[PDB]
Amino acid sequence: IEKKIVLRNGTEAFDSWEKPPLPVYTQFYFFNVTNPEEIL
Amino acid sequence: IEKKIVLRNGTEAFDSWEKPPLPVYTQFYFFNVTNPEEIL
Numbered sequence: 513i514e515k516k517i518v519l520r521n522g523t524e525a526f527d528s529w530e531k532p533p534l535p536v537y538t539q540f541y542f543f544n545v546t547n548p549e550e551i552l
Numbered sequence: 553i554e555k556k557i558v559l560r561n562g563t564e565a566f567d568s569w570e571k572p573p574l575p576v577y578t579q580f581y582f583f584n585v586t587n588p589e590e591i592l
């Protein structure tokens with residue numbers, strides 16, 4: 513029985529969900545318009 | 553002696569030079585400007 517993964521105050525699965533220990537990396541990609549007047 | 557290739561009236565090397573029998577193919581390549589106002 514894998515009842516170890518629950519959201520109970522006293523469990524280590526609730527500790528990972530309240531505070532995520534692993535960082536999240538987000539890379540913002542943009543688009544640069546080269547011919548702006550020609551689109552008009 | 554390869555005196556056969558001369559420009560004498562009576563030779564077949566002068567016939568190739570007066571009138572070139574082999575066609576010449578020329579392909580004209582152009583450049584099209586995509587962002588003309590942005591160069592200005």
Ligand SMILES: *[C@@H]1O[C@H](CO)[C@@H](O)[C@H](O)[C@H]1NC(C)=O
Nearest residue numbers: 519520521522523526527530
């Ligand atoms: C979790 O830990 C104890 C358990 O009773 C409690 O005192 C504490 O307030 C709880 N935390 C939250 C956010 O409920």
Ligand SMILES: *[C@@H]1O[C@H](CO)[C@@H](O)[C@H](O)[C@H]1NC(C)=O
Nearest residue numbers: 559560561562563566567570
């Ligand atoms: C070549 O051929 C004869 C050779 O005498 C002559 O009548 C003719 O005029 C010559 N052609 C030219 C362009 O000189």
